[PDB]
């Protein structure tokens, strides 16, 4: 049934699982085929955020099977952030602000149905790059939302929180927030602000000096080392920045 109605394309990359570029027989949609070994969370996160539009911040799943592959909305033509970041460099406070905007929404959207992501990351960011727009990809280690802390966690240790590392303490909204200063320092900056764990532990910044001090400001926020210190994501889209 799969091989009936799905035709695999290139490797777009192989953790998660590995994606395919690939078109639907029937009409050729152009579709991205996820493949993983080993029913996952994942078909039904995608489910819960999807369901009903549900969010164009959000690739939507189309499909599923067995044999486990996911088919995925393939926007045409489409980057993710980290290889953009790669090829032209960081994207200036200008595009960042309307990314970062989508970003947050997105996840906010994700929050409404009750779900975290927890690997927000700019290689789990798609750029659709004819209508301007961040997707985000790549739920696999995603969870449903509660106050509750976590230890089921399995992310991208460079956008993983100091209380994390520390104390092996998730807390889904404030390591969201972390994350989302890691991806905006990395979209500002072109690289991310900590590589070892000792840097993430320490969390000390140096800016370069292109960074507005506004946009410091609002990534020293989310970058708080104190869990509590995080501003919400309200507060974030209310930041000076982010107008
Ligand atoms: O779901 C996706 N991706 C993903 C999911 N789940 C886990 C990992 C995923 O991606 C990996 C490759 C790029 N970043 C991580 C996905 C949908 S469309 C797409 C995509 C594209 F349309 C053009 C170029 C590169 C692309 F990736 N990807």
């Given at each position: 049934?799969?091989?009936?109605?799905?035709?695999?394309?290139?490797?777009?990359?192989?953790?998660?699982?590995?994606?395919?570029?690939?078109?639907?027989?029937?009409?050729?949609?152009?579709?991205?085929?996820?493949?993983?070994?080993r029913?996952?969370?994942?078909?039904?996160?995608?489910?819960?955020?999807?369901?009903?539009?549900?969010?164009?911040?959000?690739?939507?799943?189309?499909?599923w099977?067995?044999?486990?592959m996911?088919?995925?909305?393939?926007?045409?033509?489409?980057?993710?952030?980290?290889?953009?970041?790669?090829?032209?460099?960081?994207?200036?406070?200008?595009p960042?602000?309307?990314?970062?905007?989508?970003?947050?929404?997105?996840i906010?959207?994700?929050?409404?149905?009750?779900?975290?992501?927890?690997?927000?990351?700019?290689?789990?960011?798609?750029?659709?790059?004819?209508?301007?727009?961040?997707?985000?990809?790549?739920?696999?280690?995603?969870?449903?939302?509660?106050?509750?802390?976590?230890?089921?966690?399995?992310?991208?240790?460079?956008?993983?929180?100091?209380?994390?590392?520390?104390?092996?303490?998730?807390?889904?909204?404030?390591?969201?927030?972390?994350?989302?200063?890691?991806?905006?320092?990395?979209?500002?900056?072109?690289?991310?602000?900590?590589?070892?764990?000792?840097?993430?532990?320490?969390?000390?910044?140096?800016?370069?000096?292109?960074?507005?001090?506004?946009?410091?400001?609002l990534?020293?926020?989310?970058?708080?080392?104190?869990?509590?210190?995080?501003?919400?994501?309200?507060?974030?889209?209310?930041?000076?920045?982010?107008?």
């Amino acid at each position: 049934a799969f091989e009936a109605e799905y035709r695999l394309g290139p490797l777009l990359g192989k953790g998660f699982g590995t994606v395919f570029a690939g078109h639907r027989l029937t009409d050729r949609l152009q579709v991205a085929i996820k493949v993983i070994p080993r029913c996952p969370l994942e078909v039904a996160l995608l489910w819960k955020v999807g369901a009903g539009g549900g969010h164009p911040g959000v690739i939507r799943l189309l499909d599923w099977f067995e044999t486990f592959m996911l088919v995925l909305e393939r926007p045409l033509p489409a980057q993710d952030l980290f290889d953009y970041i790669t090829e032209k460099g960081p994207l200036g406070e200008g595009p960042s602000r309307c990314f970062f905007g989508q970003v947050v929404a997105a996840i906010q959207h994700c929050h409404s149905r009750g779900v975290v992501h927890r690997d927000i990351k700019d290689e789990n960011i798609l750029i659709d790059l004819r209508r301007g727009c961040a997707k985000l990809i790549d739920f696999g280690s995603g969870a449903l939302l509660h106050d509750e802390p976590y230890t089921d966690f399995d992310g991208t240790r460079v956008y993983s929180p100091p209380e994390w590392i520390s104390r092996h303490q998730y807390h889904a909204l404030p390591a969201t927030v972390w994350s989302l200063g890691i991806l905006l320092y990395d979209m500002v900056c072109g690289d991310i602000p900590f590589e070892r764990d000792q840097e993430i532990l320490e969390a000390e910044l140096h800016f370069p000096a292109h960074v507005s001090p506004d946009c410091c400001a609002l990534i020293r926020r989310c970058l708080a080392p104190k869990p509590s210190s995080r501003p919400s994501l309200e507060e974030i889209l209310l930041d000076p920045w982010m107008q």
